[PDB]
């Protein structure tokens, strides 16, 4: 129940990047669980509060 | 700290029977 | 196997629900005494529950003996309940749910696969009938069978706070719940409702019919009801302490609405969404079956 | 001194104590104990210890983190704080409010 | 009737097999055949004579007293074949009917009273039929291949060494074989006390009574639901990551529909100047070009072999895109159980899993998710989605005793926890006989 | 005398528990046994220690070992060699391995002439036993006691565990008990004793 | 080509309050609450058939923003972005996309930045022989005009 | 050409091949099928592929 500490491990985070237009295939898509992202910069909460 | 897996099994421990010289009854 | 009383599993001793009343015994009656409500401007309409979907989870054979109450219990009452959406465990819910099927829910409130005669277990045309609606639960989480997780909580209200005239009328005000309180009241009483055998009861509001199930609704709608005031707690907006004359009186603002909360808190239980879906899920097929 | 029972040599004293704990009115008890607070999180459970400690310093001690207990104080209410010292119409994002 | 219930009956070949010579060896008349005319009370004379509830099946419709008989004594019919085998009865209430059956293993003990002649059981034959068939050389390779493993030089076995004519393999394969004295016209001679010496009677399958003794707990070990580890048929699913178990199969949703996969479905066609992939659902007949907007579909693949790997490409875009469910029977494999910190150390990307070759063992890899530690309320949300193909269609976690020893809170159990089976710590007691029992479940 | 036999100590089983932990979980109170009872009770207490995340039984490949040419890295017996096509190289991975590895496994058993001699024992004095340990003990025991998850009873500080466990033996139909034990082969001779462990 | 909003999609001013980081399966996913139903939807891959509208990007979390075009590919979300200004080229089918403009981009710039989107008339493109075997892929296009 | 059976990727060969075989009348085989062993010796001798 209690909330991780250690850096706990994770799924791959395979980044679709979507444009106005792209031509999708699926050959070798893992099977394995993983992590559609679909923009570049998602570390965005920067600023920290003591 | 990153965390961390292991595993375990239980060891063997089987021995050719030991010749003993002692005797434990008359 | 435990043949089932006239008057359902409830009237057997084994069974009784209570609570501690800052730390003593007690019915749950007793303890819904001490809540006391102040309305506010805000009026709580009780829609009609939309019917529960016919689709019970597949009857998939798992491994292992599912422990189906305490996962109930948990996720409805339980600090952090985690997995509650699982599929296994109602998997094997809806192997219950058979018309001829091996498996056997104990007293113990576990599922055995086996023909285990050591142990008790409830008869099996109740837990089928039991089975047969609150397998339901396994669809908590999928899409398109997520039940309202808002309007239903009116019911909640009414089934709580909601005073004969205010049911009869299918429509109160938003009410602020408050009773003299102890240190960790509400965290201490989910303790005690958490440890219910709920399978008692939903069986018996499964499969009890007529005279006795009305005996069973106006005998048990205080435990019901206790039930209920957990989940409120776990939904409430915002839940304080007054001081009055050197006696504490815990506030819980709102009754019947919730405020979706997820982030966990000191005064009382949370739900995280998954346990907000399995809760409304829950809801959604227990007020079906009250309301019948 | 309650530790002393059945291990002072000191005849008399374990006499004393013996009869001090074996009253009704008194009962010695150490370690882990069932609070009305046990379950109750804080980003941790807490839990309460009968302690070898003086009343005074445990009552500050039980006063302290009942004051954390009762506090609070969340995200939005630093997001708030924020937004009055940033520019009017900064949007803020992130952690639940809860 | 319950599946156990009804008439039960075996092919000669199987009569031959194993129960004749066993009548032959216990002295007992040949079971009577069964043809049109064929009173109860014979059949109880046969039965009764032979101490074996066995009657040949010859010829004509049987009629009803004497089913009846069949039915309500166990007896086992024995029949030629199993060609329009309701006609070799007389159907008083037309109950019967040839699809109408239950196919099981019978073990001999359950026919024979006599213990001395069954060596074996049921698992046996489970265990045959988990082999390939083989060809004799095939046999011979295993025969010597176990030697070398026992150390044993096998060379010149099962040979003719003869000086002119060169080796001469013979075939080694002799199942159920038995020692028995031929005349001298090559013919062979049932087995006589008065002249054949005891030992002779019955050949035990060639094997020392200790080594019976053993292969009997062996065949209960390896018949134990525990060992049988390897794994048939993936599910293929786009589904988001979310049950924590292993063992998660996703139940096919209310609105698809079952579809055998077969190469006819698929075909090149015309659609917006490209030859697409089109893919005609065999009940509306409608034929759809591209993977997205497809009918929701359960399709079963009984086999991969011939599929073109447009056709698999395709059918995961639609897996993904027209979100098809996808059962793959062909694939065999074995199923590591990883815990959240190991994470997952191979890999299998859809392709290799529609194109590996048939009897390969794939090794997939499932995460048991349940001891993975709440995430800090101040992690920032995930915008996107952890996603999931590959699924078990059975249970995979059978070797599994226990799991998560740990506490939720300080003292409730985890959703999901295992605790050890009541079995695990029984340690009853030594049979009258010498074998392991667990307790009385009650005092009785 | 003929070596019909393979006199050994301490003897392994075909079966074994296996077990991956989470190494992230630990109790934070540290739990201390009397030496005895960690003699005794110890060796399944480190198996079923906290923060494991499954226990597994798997077959024992120390005993099974590769000279019987079994593979047990998967959770199959595999057997190479065996069951194969003639006149071409079996293709690795074949899942025929685990045919022929079933019967390497039957054929190991159907072969096992270990004959078990009393290796090492102690006899704890009860006083030294915690209640729930001595009512476990009779007695003698050997120095190798194996795991158990009847050990783990008021040892294990997964309180669900503990009480499913001890449930589980406090049922009738179930006893655990470890140690020298009354057979009907009790003082039958044969050069030396039989007695029952 | 402008596509139409399928029937049953649902008109949804977007507004950042619809947004918010929530627990949900040991994971701070960003849920959206849909204001018909109230329902909070955690992942992108459920959520209702949603015809959201967006008059100005401005002070959205760009996690929110990508959760958005996320649910515009899970969940078949229509999302129109009123606050954009582009020109356009339209390329003959025989010189192919010279450009691309991500969704990223889309979604993130400052109003007033001026995209360049380019479109293909496919009228003039050539037809596939009668036997030649089927391609594997499909292609897609997820930016789409609001006028001719 | 009874091999390409299930494995061309032409979709009428192969339905025209599948429905050639199975007709009653045509079946297609690769032997062994025949193996004669000596009367004496007991061994293998002609065989028919």
Same mark, same amino acid.
């Given at each position: ?50 | ?26 | 196997? !435990? @043949? ?5 599993? $409830?009237?057997? *001793?084994?069974?009784?629900? %209570? #609570?501690?009343?800052?730390? +003593? ?6 303890? !819904? @005494? ?5 309305? $506010?401007?805000? *009026?709580?309409?009780?829609? %009609? #529950?939309?019917?529960?979907? +016919? ?23 339980? #600090? ?213 | ?98 | ?444 | ?197």
């Amino acid at each position: 129940d209690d909330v991780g500490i250690m850096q706990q491990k994770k799924p791959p985070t395979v980044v679709q990047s979507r444009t106005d237009v792209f031509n999708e295939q699926f050959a070798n898509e893992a099977l394995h669980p993983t992590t559609k992202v679909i923009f570049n910069g998602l570390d965005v909460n920067t600023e920290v509060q003591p | 700290k990153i965390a961390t897996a292991s595993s375990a099994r239980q060891a063997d421990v089987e021995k050719p029977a030991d010749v003993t010289f002692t005797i434990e009854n008359v | 196997m !435990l @043949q089932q009383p006239t008057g359902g599993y $409830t009237t057997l *001793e084994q069974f009784a629900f %209570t #609570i501690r009343n800052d730390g +003593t015994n007690a019915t749950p009656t007793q303890f !819904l @005494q001490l809540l006391s409500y102040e309305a $506010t401007e805000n *009026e709580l309409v009780k829609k %009609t #529950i939309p019917t529960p979907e +016919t689709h019970l989870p597949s009857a998939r054979n798992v491994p292992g003996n599912v422990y189906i109450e305490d996962a109930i219990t948990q996720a409805l009452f339980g #600090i952090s309940a985690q997995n509650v959406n699982a599929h296994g465990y109602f998997s094997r819910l809806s192997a219950l749910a058979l018309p001829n099927t091996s498996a056997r829910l104990g007293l113990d409130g576990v599922i055995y696969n086996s023909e285990t005669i050591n142990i008790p277990f409830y008869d099996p045309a109740a837990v089928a009938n039991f089975a047969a609606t609150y397998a339901k639960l396994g669809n908590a989480s999928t899409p398109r069978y997520r039940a309202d997780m808002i309007d239903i909580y009116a019911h909640v209200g009414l089934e709580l706070a909601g005073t004969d005239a205010e049911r009869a009328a299918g429509v109160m005000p938003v009410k602020r719940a408050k009773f003299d309180s102890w240190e960790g009241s509400l965290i201490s009483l989910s303790r005690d409702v958490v440890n219910w055998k709920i399978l008692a009861f939903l069986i018996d509001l499964c499969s009890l019919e007529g005279e006795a199930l009305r005996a069973f609704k106006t005998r048990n709608r205080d435990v019901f009801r206790m039930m209920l005031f957990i989940m409120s707690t776990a939904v409430a907006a915002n839940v304080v302490n007054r001081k009055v004359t050197k006696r504490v009186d815990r506030v819980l603002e709102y009754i019947g609405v919730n405020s979706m909360r997820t982030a966990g808190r000191t005064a009382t239980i949370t739900y995280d969404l998954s346990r907000h879906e399995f809760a409304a899920k829950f809801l959604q097929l227990t007020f079906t079956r009250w309301n019948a | 001194p309650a530790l002393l029972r059945d291990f002072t040599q000191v005849n008399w004293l374990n006499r004393d104590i013996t009869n001090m704990l074996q009253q009704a009115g008194t009962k010695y008890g150490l370690g882990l104990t069932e609070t009305r607070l046990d379950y109750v999180r804080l980003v941790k459970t807490i839990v309460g210890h009968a302690l070898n400690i003086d009343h005074f310093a445990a009552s500050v001690l039980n006063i302290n983190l009942r004051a954390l207990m009762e506090a609070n104080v969340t995200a939005d209410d630093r997001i708030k704080a924020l937004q009055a010292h940033s520019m009017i119409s900064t949007q803020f994002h992130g952690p639940n409010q809860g | 009737d319950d599946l156990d219930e009804g008439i039960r009956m075996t092919t000669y070949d199987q009569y031959l097999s194993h129960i004749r010579e066993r009548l032959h060896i216990t002295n007992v008349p040949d079971p009577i055949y069964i043809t049109g005319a064929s009173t109860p009370d014979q059949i109880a004379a046969s039965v009764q004579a032979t101490h074996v509830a066995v009657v040949l099946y010859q010829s004509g419709v049987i009629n009803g007293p004497a089913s009846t008989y069949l039915r309500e004594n166990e007896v086992l019919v024995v029949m030629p074949d199993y060609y329009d085998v309701v006609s070799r009865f007389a159907n008083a209430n037309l109950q019967m009917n040839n699809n109408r059956y239950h196919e099981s293993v019978l073990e001999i003990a359950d026919i024979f009273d006599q213990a001395d002649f069954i060596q074996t059981s049921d698992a046996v034959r489970q265990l045959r039929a988990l082999m390939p068939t083989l060809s004799t050389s095939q046999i011979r390779h295993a025969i010597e291949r176990i030697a070398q493993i026992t150390d044993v030089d096998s060379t010149d076995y099962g040979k003719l060494t003869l000086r002119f004519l060169g080796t001469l393999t013979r075939s080694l394969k002799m199942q159920n074989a038995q020692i028995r004295r031929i005349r001298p016209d090559g013919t062979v001679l049932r087995y006589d006390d008065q002249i054949d010496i005891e030992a002779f009677r019955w050949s035990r399958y060639f094997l020392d009574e200790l080594q019976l003794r053993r292969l009997s707990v062996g065949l209960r070990l390896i018949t134990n639901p525990r060992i049988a580890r390897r794994f048939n048929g993936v599910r293929i699913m786009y589904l988001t990551d979310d049950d924590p178990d292993p063992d998660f199969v996703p139940d096919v949703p209310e609105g698809y529909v079952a579809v055998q996969y077969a190469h006819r479905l698929f075909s090149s066609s015309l659609a917006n100047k490209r030859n697409r992939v089109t893919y005609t659902h065999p009940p509306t007949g409608m034929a759809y070009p591209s993977p997205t907007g497809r009918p929701h579909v359960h399709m079963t693949i009984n086999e991969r072999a011939g599929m073109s790997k447009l056709v698999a490409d395709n059918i995961i875009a639609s897996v993904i895109k027209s979100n098809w469910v996808v059962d793959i029977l062909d694939i065999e494999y074995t199923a590591e159980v990883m815990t959240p910190s190991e994470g997952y150390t191979q890999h299998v990307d859809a392709e290799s899993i529609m194109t590996a070759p048939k009897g390969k063992l794939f090794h997939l890899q499932f995460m048991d998710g349940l001891l993975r530690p709440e995430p800090s309320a101040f992690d920032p949300p995930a915008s996107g989605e952890d996603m999931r193909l590959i699924y078990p269609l059975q249970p995979i976690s059978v070797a599994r005793s226990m799991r998560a020893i740990v506490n939720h809170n300080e003292v409730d159990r985890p959703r999901g926890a295992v605790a050890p089976s009541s079995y695990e710590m029984d340690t009853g007691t030594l049979s009258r006989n010498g074998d392991l029992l667990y307790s009385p479940v009650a005092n009785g | 005398l003929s070596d019909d036999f393979k006199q050994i100590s301490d003897p392994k089983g075909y079966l074994t528990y296996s077990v991956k932990y989470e190494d992230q979980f630990t109790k934070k109170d540290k739990l201390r046994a009397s030496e005895a009872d960690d003699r005794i009770v110890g060796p399944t207490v480190n198996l079923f220690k906290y923060g494991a995340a499954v226990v597994n039984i798997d077959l024992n490949r120390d005993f099974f070992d590769t000279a019987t040419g079994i593979d047990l890295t998967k959770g199959i017996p595999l057997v190479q060699d065996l069951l194969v096509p003639i006149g071409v190289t079996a293709g690795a991975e074949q899942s025929a391995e685990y045919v022929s590895g079933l019967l390497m496994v039957l054929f190991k058993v159907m072969t096992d002439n270990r004959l078990v001699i009393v290796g090492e024992t102690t006899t704890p004095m009860s006083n030294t036993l915690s209640t729930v340990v001595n009512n476990v003990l009779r007695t003698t025991y050997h120095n190798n006691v194996g795991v158990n998850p009847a050990l783990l009873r008021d040892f294990t500080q997964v309180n669900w565990l503990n009480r499913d466990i001890t449930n589980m033996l406090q049922q009738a139909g179930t006893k655990y008990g470890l140690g020298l034990t009354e057979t009907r082969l009790d003082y039958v001779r044969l050069v030396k004793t039989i007695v029952g462990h």
